[PDB]
Amino acid sequence: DQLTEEQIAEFKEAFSLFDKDGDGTITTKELGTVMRSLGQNPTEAELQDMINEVDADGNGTIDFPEFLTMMARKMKDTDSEEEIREAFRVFDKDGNGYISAAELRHVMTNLGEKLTDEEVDEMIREADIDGDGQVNYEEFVQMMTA
Amino acid sequence: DQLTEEQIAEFKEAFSLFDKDGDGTITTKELGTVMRSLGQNPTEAELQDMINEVDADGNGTIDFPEFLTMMARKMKDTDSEEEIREAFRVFDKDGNGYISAAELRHVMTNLGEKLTDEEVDEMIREADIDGDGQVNYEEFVQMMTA
Amino acid sequence: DQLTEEQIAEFKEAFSLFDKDGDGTITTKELGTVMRSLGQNPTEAELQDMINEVDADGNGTIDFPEFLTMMARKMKDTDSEEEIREAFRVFDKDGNGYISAAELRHVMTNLGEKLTDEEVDEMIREADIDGDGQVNYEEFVQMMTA
Amino acid sequence: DQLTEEQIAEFKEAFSLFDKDGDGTITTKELGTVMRSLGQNPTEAELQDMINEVDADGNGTIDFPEFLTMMARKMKDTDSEEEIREAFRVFDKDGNGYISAAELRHVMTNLGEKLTDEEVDEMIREADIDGDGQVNYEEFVQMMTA
Amino acid sequence: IGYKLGHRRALFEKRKRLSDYALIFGMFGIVVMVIETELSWGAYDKASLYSLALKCLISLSTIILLGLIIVYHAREIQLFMVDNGADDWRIAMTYERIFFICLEILVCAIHPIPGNYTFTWTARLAFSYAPSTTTADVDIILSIPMFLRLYLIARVMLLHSKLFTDASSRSIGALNKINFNTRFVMKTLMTICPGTVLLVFSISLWIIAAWTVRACERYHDQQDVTSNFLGAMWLISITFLSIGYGDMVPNTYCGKGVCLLTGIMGAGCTALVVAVVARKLELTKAEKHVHNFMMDTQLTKRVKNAAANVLRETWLIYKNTKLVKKIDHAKVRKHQRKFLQAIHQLRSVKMEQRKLNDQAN
Amino acid sequence: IGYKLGHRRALFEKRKRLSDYALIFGMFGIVVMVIETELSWGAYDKASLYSLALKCLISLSTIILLGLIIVYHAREIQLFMVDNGADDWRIAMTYERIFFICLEILVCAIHPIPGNYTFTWTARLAFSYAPSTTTADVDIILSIPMFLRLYLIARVMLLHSKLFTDASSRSIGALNKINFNTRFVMKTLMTICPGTVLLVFSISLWIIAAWTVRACERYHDQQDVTSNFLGAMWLISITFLSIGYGDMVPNTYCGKGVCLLTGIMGAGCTALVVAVVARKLELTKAEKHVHNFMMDTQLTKRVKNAAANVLRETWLIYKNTKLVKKIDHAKVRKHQRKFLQAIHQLRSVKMEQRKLNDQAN
Amino acid sequence: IGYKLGHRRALFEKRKRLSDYALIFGMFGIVVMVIETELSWGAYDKASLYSLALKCLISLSTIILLGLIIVYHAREIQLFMVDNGADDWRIAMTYERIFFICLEILVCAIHPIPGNYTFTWTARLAFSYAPSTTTADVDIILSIPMFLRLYLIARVMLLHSKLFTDASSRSIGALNKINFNTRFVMKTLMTICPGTVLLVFSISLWIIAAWTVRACERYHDQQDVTSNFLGAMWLISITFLSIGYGDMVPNTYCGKGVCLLTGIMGAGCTALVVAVVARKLELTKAEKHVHNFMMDTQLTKRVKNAAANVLRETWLIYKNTKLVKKIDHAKVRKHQRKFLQAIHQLRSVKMEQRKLNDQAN
Amino acid sequence: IGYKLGHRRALFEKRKRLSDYALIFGMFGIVVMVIETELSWGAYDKASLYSLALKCLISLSTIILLGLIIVYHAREIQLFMVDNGADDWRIAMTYERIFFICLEILVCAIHPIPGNYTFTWTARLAFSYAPSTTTADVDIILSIPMFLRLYLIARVMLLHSKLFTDASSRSIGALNKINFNTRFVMKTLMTICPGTVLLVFSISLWIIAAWTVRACERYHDQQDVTSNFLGAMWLISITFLSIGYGDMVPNTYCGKGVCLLTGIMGAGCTALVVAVVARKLELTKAEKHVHNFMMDTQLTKRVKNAAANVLRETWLIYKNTKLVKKIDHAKVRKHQRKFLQAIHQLRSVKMEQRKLNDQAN
Ligand SMILES: [Ca+2]
Ligand SMILES: [Ca+2]
Ligand SMILES: [Ca+2]
Ligand SMILES: [Ca+2]
Ligand SMILES: [Ca+2]
Ligand SMILES: [Ca+2]
Ligand SMILES: [Ca+2]
Ligand SMILES: [Ca+2]
Ligand SMILES: [K+]
Ligand SMILES: [K+]
Ligand SMILES: [K+]
Ligand SMILES: [K+]
């Protein structure tokens, strides 16, 4: 379970696919080139949030030890972190990441299986801890932690 | 018979298809975009005559009460007012609508099932109300009215 | 029989296909528009020689009497004037319509069923009336006329 | 065995395929147009090395006697000079024609059927007689020559 | 206008409601006819009271169905009058409209009436050409055409269609001048889910045709060949696929007609199913893109290996021919053979890579 | 000029008129032959006077038809002379024009002549391999080839074609150098209305082939199998569809040849018909756009519903595990299962929407 | 993380290892069943000891296979728990998952148990409609379904797939969100090498179906027709191609069902093979370019030849008509005919040249 | 180099010359075998001298053919040595090359040797399942495989190919790196003239297969069913089209194998032929343009007529409604019906014109 030499060799070969230059780091253009061959055209803003998601040194560099961490989340069938991301952005417009309590109460009582009024009141009370009314949907970071 | 509350919901949901902004007002560009996705490219001149045909307030904006009136005319199998317009536009040249009695007598005695010369003589006499010769085909609005 | 009213009506209706204006005159652009819809893109020089081929008044316009003459040559399965002319253009690429006596003797003794030297010697002698060497192939209209 | 008169006619007819304007000379543009009709778009650098490969006069022009020499190498199923040259270009980088001796030890011991360390050590000694380090693969021509 | 749209909607619901009762009263009659036909062969005879009761029930259901059809057509004429701004119903009566109402009445009016009636039936046996004569009842002639009542299912499906009964659908279709007829819904269903339609149609036709063949073959089969239900199923299946008849040729023209219809239907159904299956086996987007990447990687690796082999063989030939004092001709010949083989492999993989790139273009 | 066009038009009408008489005098002879063949089997014998009268009528019609063909070809040669600027008719004979005239004469000259002639016929029966010998009349040999007179219908259709007899059509075609032969009209008809052509051809071939099979099978069938008209119709239908022969194998080579021709024709007719049917089931542009619009709306609604479900399931788990005191593990396990199911539904509907948007263009 | 990736790889190998043993223990049982069935007909009877020993071996292999299946499913549940961040195994137990395990157990549990059991079998003979009754053993009913154990080959192929077990393949697929199910591998194999798959599937089905038909037909065939192995092979081949049954109709419903399945499979296999063959006959880009170049060359040569011939004929006509004093009309007529022929040839070759140039686009 | 090209050209001619003699000496043997087989059944027996003389001729021709094959392969090895810059012939001897020479020798070595040899043959009759035993000669076993000598026609066609023996074509292929194998010529012929190839292949296979079936069926047919030549032709034709067997099932595995091969070939040949026929029925560019022009003109005329009719009906309604004092309601209703009909016709023609324009886009 300690990633024997043959197993590391397989990941070494996979790493060289993105790392065309052979220096040992994956740049934004190196990653973007691969995704363009697969039928995707992401912007530099979309690209930037992927490196720093896995990057730990804060230098825009993806070395071999960091490349392994990215694979672990990718090979997973379902990621509870990412699935909740896609749910909010369906109802989250303006690209700001904030949901008012007016729309949150409406969607949860009319769309889907529908909650009940006292449940959403408790949910909003727990969700709107700040009390400003603008509920940034990043509350799931502490919601799934427990 | 009136309209049930559920029936208004069906028409309100249909209204939201054009009312993308949620402002309760249908603009010229809002109506144009949906028609472009259906395979049509009308000019602004064609679009303008559509709103004011149903618009009653004269503000160039279709609201919900006016939207219901437009649907009534569109859902009919045949509209006697519109079909007569299409027949005249076939023989209408220069985009003015003031064809003279020279072509009117020719088409009605040589094309189709054809009419007797006595019939068209009375027809032209009734048609030539202005008397100049340039017979405006707007007489159809009073033909069906009486 | 030659001037039956029904036959003239048939050709008059066909004449209106090119005569879009309706005046009774076929212009160069009117003829070119019809030929463009059939998959051909002739140049101005190519179409210009078509009008004057049947134009008798020299005004550059084709009227109804000249239109009938053009049809008579077109309805024929084989036209001796055109096919002989088209055969010369195969060996005439410079565009001036002149063929030297050197190539003329070459093609007629090696290509096709081939002619013996005695016959081509008389043929060249009859063809080279000018004697300059540049044998213009206008002699073909002389051959058919006589 | 020699070349009979009819055989020269076959090769002369094939010569006219490239030499459009019959003057006994094949230019760079004449060769390029033919290869463009076959789905190939070479650069002028690629074209230039084709003529001087068979050009003995050094005038940058292929005549009939040199055209026969080019055909002889083309009709062969396999050319030992060319096939070995294409193998080197697989591992050739920067287009300079030089490969460091470090790469030779890696490819010959890990790729393909692989050679033993003693074999390659003798090979490097014979190939890298100069000892500079940069091994130009022009040494392949002197292998088959002797 | 509120009233005008409200009046139009009420007629739609009234017309929708009347279509379900007709389907119910048609299917009830069909089921009762099937039960009577099955039970009148061995359980009781045609002079008992059970046959009388069942036929009376069939007649009552037929009368109710005819009344329902008349009311439905009256409501449809009212809807036509509303939809064209006409104030007289005589304007809606054309030759085409009248003919179809009479056709519907004639189709829905046929059923086995109560009584006791018989006729003489003569048939020519199969594979033996022997005559066969028997006395049969008339009700078999009147009960087979009763399957024509299945055209009401299409009407019920059309009136219950989501596209037909959605305000947004009509609003969008009006702007594009689309006729919401029966053909449009069928084409939409074929575009969405053709396989389900094909399967349901094939199974229903299979069962109905097998039962009909058995019913026609009861009277002249005294050997349990074509009157067997499983045998009829197998015969219909092998006629649908156009394999042959085997020894299952019917002795009756009813069976021959049913077999001809089954073959005609199968001729097209097979092609449609094959086309659907061929379409469903292809890769989609974002799958070819993944496949081509791996193909390119493998091709690159194999090209590098072939080039390495070529160079190794060249070096071995040179070493064995010059460096070594004695010359072993077998070794150099073997190495030259391997050299040629490596050259051929290299050009083959190069051609394959070029073809893959051209395909991916 | 005026006269040249007028003279050319007169020849067209003269040639058009002569083609109808030939068709009339061919169809009359075919019908009389069919009636004579049918009535000479049971009504009277071959030594009576009715056969003599009918055969005399056939011979007279044949003579008139041959004369009409000769006059038609003379008029066509005159038209050829006019259309090529030739002043001698001998420039029209080209070893190919002569051959087809003789072929037409030979085809149209065959008919049953009056008299009384017989020969001996021997056949091998099917499924029993028993010999069969009978004496038959020669007129059956001479009357079957009479169906070759059907090539005149194509000529009549070509000479009456709207494209062939329209001044504007010829004027436009001349500019584009189009040959107005008989092959152009057939291809135009196939492009316009293929189904009608296929149906008419199939029905005519069906009836004619069944009658021919019955006529050749009369002489050696003493059991009413292949001499039955309905049986012949069924045999032709099942050979056309390539299902099999059943027990309907002919005892004569006429039947074998006709079945072979029917199978050859059906092999291609089936493919053409199924291609036409497949082409007739597709949607048009406007209805495709409407369908795409409605599908996009439905997918949007379902995506929103799945996204709501995901968040609903997430909150509950927290509520029933942190906020609540006791932990009911069954509830949290059920909610986690529902959470995973909602995630899968959301990604499925998103994939479907992406596929629709990718295939829309 | 080092441990997390290492833990997943260990479970993958453990699950891969368990799939080979199941295939081995299924194929062993199938082979032993076939040998026992073959040898229990003529070598020994069903009351000896060899049958007891062989059936005991079959039962032992079945028990081992069931245990292996249980362990495999336990390991797969562990992998599911690892792959979704779940710490309780009860979350993985859904209705869909439980049903398939029971289905697998039921499929793999059927086998001929030791003992001596018999029943009565009655069948209706073909082409004679004669009854036939015999006493048969129960083990034939329990041994035919044993062929359902072939679904393990697909599992073994999937777990040994290069795409399924390659780090780079999974890494690339994760970015594009591709599900590596068993359907993806089948589609990839069909895209790569369809002919090999079709051939192997057809041969395996042929052999297995022929053996099954012979086994079902042993009991009621006393004439060596459908119990012959070569006859069964021929019958399966002609049913696959849909030519007919000949005189090889089975007397048992088992044979009828196998023939129906063979026909259903062939209906699609034939079309797929035909499409593959049609695709295999196309030219490539370079071949098309070379062919077009050569064709253009020959067309140019023929155009030049026809153009020369036209002028030669024109000059000959002019010479014979004017230069010569006495005019030989036969010569000038012949030359005019040749002139017209040359004109027609020239225009035909010009049309072909234009068509080729247009097509090259 | 002059000598190098001259030496290469001489070997090509020497190799071409040797291929014609092999074809001659193979066809001579095949024809003599056919004549001997036909004449040894009824004319003379197998112990006379004519059989001895004919089989001696066959053996002599076989010896000459083997010698010619050996010389041809020697010349081809010389060509290989010249074309690869080799100097030892042992480098050309690989495992693949040696196997094909032995295969050719084995294929061409089989023939009926002189002598008198017999064996015992037992067959099971069709439709009756009766045993049949006879004594037959061995020469029938050795003479059927002699048809494998037809692979020399492909070699002769390849060596005489215009592309294979043209300097310009070879030069262009060399520049484009094209392999001039036997597959390239077949694909080129299929692209150029597929119908001719299909027809020739089908006719040759038909005749050869029918003769082979008759020859194998001679020994066990005492009823003149499958030994008849016309019956064999009909059986092969109906197996090729997959209609059925009728009552023509062979009693020998010869016939079964030949029928299986015929069905396999027909399955693909029918699809190829129908594809070619469908491709040959389409219009060209100029024809399409002319057709579109004429259709547009007709549509314009019909649109104008419908538009005029609508206004005529409107005026008539208005006149009868108000201008006349007494109102005849029947006339008003009739005119309103005609008004609606005209509206429907107008919109239908407008839709048709729009569809035509969209198609022409
Ligand atoms: Ca890098
Ligand atoms: Ca970093
Ligand atoms: Ca708005
Ligand atoms: Ca307004
Ligand atoms: Ca004008
Ligand atoms: Ca003029
Ligand atoms: Ca030059
Ligand atoms: Ca030079
Ligand atoms: K079939
Ligand atoms: K078929
Ligand atoms: K069949
Ligand atoms: K059959």
Curated annotation (Swiss-Prot), chains A, B, C, D:
Ca(2+) 4 binds at D128, D130, D132, Q134, E139. The lineage of its organism: Eukaryota, Metazoa, Chordata, Craniata, Vertebrata. It comes from the Eukaryota. The keyword Methyltransferase does not apply. This is Calmodulin-1. PANTHER family: CALMODULIN LIKE 3, MYOSIN LIGHT CHAIN 1, 3. Ca(2+) 2 binds at D55, D57, N59, T61, E66. Residues 6-41, 42-77, 79-114, 115-146 form the EF-hand domain. The modification N6-methyllysine is found at K114. Calmodulin acts as part of a calcium signal transduction pathway by mediating the control of a large number of enzymes, ion channels, aquaporins and other proteins through calcium-binding. Calcium-binding is required for the activation of calmodulin. Among the enzymes to be stimulated by the calmodulin-calcium complex are a number of protein kinases, such as myosin light-chain kinases and calmodulin-dependent protein kinase type II (CaMK2), and phosphatases. InterPro entries: CALM/Myosin/TropC-like (IPR050230), EF-hand-dom_pair (IPR011992), EF_Hand_1_Ca_BS (IPR018247), EF_hand_dom (IPR002048).
UniProtKB/Swiss-Prot annotation, chains E, F, G, H:
One of its GO terms (molecular function) is inward rectifier potassium channel activity. Keywords: Calmodulin-binding, Cytoplasm, Ion channel, Ion transport, Membrane, Phosphoprotein, Transmembrane, Transmembrane helix, Transport. It catalyses: K(+)(in) = K(+)(out). Changing K280E: Moderately reduces inward rectifier potassium channel activity. Loss of inward rectifier potassium channel activity. Significantly increases outward single-channel conductance at positive potentials. Changing N228G: Reduced inhibition by apamin but binding to apamin is unaffected. Changing K280N: Highly decreases inward rectifier potassium channel activity. It is a multi-pass membrane protein. Changing N251H: Reduced inhibition by apamin but binding to apamin is unaffected. Brain. Residues 296-361 are annotated as: Calmodulin-binding. It comes from the Eukaryota. Belongs to the potassium channel KCNN family. KCa2.2/KCNN2 subfamily. Small conductance calcium-activated potassium channel that mediates the voltage-independent transmembrane transfer of potassium across the cell membrane through a constitutive interaction with calmodulin which binds the intracellular calcium allowing its opening. The current is characterized by a voltage-independent activation, an intracellular calcium concentration increase-dependent activation and a single-channel conductance of about 3 picosiemens. The calmodulin-binding domain (CaMBD) forms an elongated dimer with a calmodulin molecule bound at each end; each calmodulin wraps around three alpha-helices, two from one CaMBD subunit and one from the other. The coiled-coil domaim mediates heteromeic assembly. This is Small conductance calcium-activated potassium channel protein 2.
